[PDB]
Design a protein around this ligand. Structure first.
Ligand SMILES: CC1(C)CCCN(c2ccc(O)c(C(=O)c3ccc(C(=O)N[C@@H]4CCCNC[C@H]4NC(=O)c4ccncc4)cc3)c2)C1
Lengths: 341, 20
C-alpha cells in the first residue's frame, strides 16, 4: 500500500503531462520583456543567461539557441523534444519552464533561475561528497527517473554539470536536449562519454535502463570525486566501459559497492532499475535504508549543504563566461523547421 | 593514486555530449 499511492500519484501525473504533451504551450513571452544580465553557461548552439522579467522583477534563466546552428548540426528533432518535454513535465526536482518563444534568429526558453550553481562546481571544489551527502542527491534522482520513465521519457544526459542546486540545497535537473518520449527502443549515439551505458557504445539499441547505468556513474563520481571510467580520449573511455571492470575506493562502504555493482551491470537482465520490481529494487536497497522517500519528495529532509546566496540575481556560485550581444536578423531563418516551437 | 591521475587528465572540466 506504500507502492500503491505512488502508483496513484503517478497516474494523475501522467494525465497532467499528456494534456500538455498533446497541446504544447507556445509564444508566451517576447525577448524585450527581459533584461539580460549574465551568462550562466554555454553550449554548441547558444547559452543560458540570468535575466530579469521586467513586469514582475522576477529572475529567470533563459536558454537561447541559434536556429541556423541547430540545423547545421542536425539537432532539430532533439531541440523540439527538449522544449516539448520541458513545458509538459512537473516534478520538484525538474527545473520549471515559465515561458518559451522564438524570433527570426533564435529559440528561447525561460526557466526558473537556480542560484546554487551546478553540482559539478561544488563536487570539484570539495573533492568528493561523503556517502550521506551523495545519498541525499541520489535519492532525488531516483524519484525523478521514476517520474520520467512512467511518462515514457528517457533523460539520457545525467551528470553533475546538469544538476543545479537550489536555495534549499535540493536538485533541479536541467538540459533536456537528449530527452525523448519513447515506448520500446531507440538508437541515437548520444550522451556524455563517461556516463554512456555499454549498450549505447555497442549500437545495440537501448531503453530507459541506460538512465540507471548513468545513475551508477553519478553516485560513484559523487562518492569518489572522479568517475569509474575516465581517460584522456573518448575511445579509451568506451573500451573501459564495455569491459565493465569497476574498481572502488577503499573508503566506499560495502553497501555502496553492492549498489554500484548492480547499477553498473552490463547484463540488462541483472541491472537494477530494469527488473520485475523496477525502481523498488533501488529504493529498498540497503545503501538507501536511512532514506525516507516521501520526506525527500516533500523537501522535508534537511540538506547537508545550503549554498551562500547574497541577494537575488547573484551569480557567485557560477563561473564567468565570455559575453556576446544577441543579434536578431531582419529575415526569418529556418521557419518551417521550428514551427512547432 | 587514481585521484591524482584524474586531476592530471583533460576530463576534469565540463564535459560536452557527443553526436555521430
Ligand atoms: C552535444 C551537441 C554538440 C550535439 C547534440 C545536441 N546538443 C544540444 C542539445 C540541446 C541543446 O539545448 C543544446 C545547447 O546548445 C545548449 C545551450 C546552452 C546550454 C547551457 O548553457 N546549459 C547550462 C550549462 C551546461 C551545464 N548544464 C547546466 C545549464 N544551466 C542551467 O540550465 C541553469 C538553469 C537555471 N539556473 C542556472 C543554470 C546547454 C545546451 C545542445 C549539443
Amino acid at each position: 500500500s506504500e507502492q500503491e499511492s505512488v502508483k496513484e500519484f503517478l497516474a494523475k501525473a501522467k494525465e497532467d503531462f499528456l494534456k500538455k504533451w498533446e497541446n504544447p504551450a507556445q509564444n508566451t513571452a517576447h525577448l524585450d520583456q527581459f533584461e539580460r544580465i549574465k551568462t550562466l553557461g554555454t553550449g554548441s548552439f547558444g547559452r543560458v543567461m540570468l535575466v530579469k522579467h521586467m513586469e514582475t522583477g522576477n529572475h529567470y534563466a533563459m536558454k537561447i539557441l541559434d536556429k541556423q546552428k541547430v540545423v547545421k548540426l542536425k539537432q532539430i528533432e532533439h531541440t523540439l523534444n527538449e522544449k516539448r518535454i520541458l513545458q509538459a513535465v512537473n516534478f520538484p526536482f525538474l527545473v520549471k519552464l515559465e515561458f518559451s518563444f522564438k524570433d527570426n534568429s533564435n529559440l528561447y526558453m525561460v526557466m526558473e533561475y537556480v542560484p546554487g550553481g551546478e553540482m559539478f562546481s561544488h563536487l570539484r571544489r570539495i573533492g568528493r561528497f561523503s556517502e550521506p551527502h551523495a545519498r541525499f542527491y541520489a535519492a532525488q534522482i531516483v524519484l525523478t527517473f521514476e517520474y520520467l520513465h512512467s511518462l515514457d521519457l528517457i533523460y539520457r544526459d545525467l551528470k553533475p554539470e546538469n544538476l543545479l542546486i537550489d536555495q534549499q540545497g535540493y536538485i533541479q535537473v536541467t538540459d533536456f536536449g537528449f530527452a525523448k518520449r519513447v515506448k520500446g527502443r531507440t538508437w541515437t549515439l548520444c550522451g556524455t562519454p563517461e556516463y554512456l551505458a555499454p549498450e549505447i557504445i555497442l549500437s545495440k539499441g537501448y531503453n530507459k535502463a541506460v538512465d540507471w547505468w548513468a545513475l551508477g556513474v553519478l553516485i560513484y563520481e559523487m562518492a569518489a570525486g572522479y568517475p569509474p571510467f575516465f581517460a584522456d580520449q573518448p575511445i579509451q573511455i568506451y573500451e573501459k566501459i564495455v569491459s565493465g571492470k569497476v574498481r572502488f575506493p577503499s573508503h566506499f562502504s560495502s553497501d555502496l559497492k553492492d549498489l554500484l555493482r548492480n547499477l553498473l551491470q552490463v547484463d540488462l537482465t541483472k541491472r537494477f532499475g530494469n527488473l520485475k520490481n523496477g525502481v523498488n529494487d533501488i529504493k529498498n536497497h540497503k545503501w538507501f535504508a536511512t532514506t525516507d522517500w516521501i520526506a525527500i519528495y516533500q523537501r522535508k529532509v534537511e540538506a547537508p549543504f545550503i549554498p551562500k546566496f547574497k541577494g537575488p540575481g547573484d551569480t557567485s556560485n557560477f563561473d564567468d563566461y565570455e559575453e556576446e550581444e544577441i543579434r536578431v536578423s531582419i529575415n526569418e531563418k529556418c521557419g518551417k523547421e521550428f514551427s512547432e516551437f | 593514486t587514481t585521484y591524482a591521475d584524474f586531476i592530471a587528465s583533460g576530463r576534469t572540466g565540463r564535459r560536452n555530449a557527443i553526436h555521430d
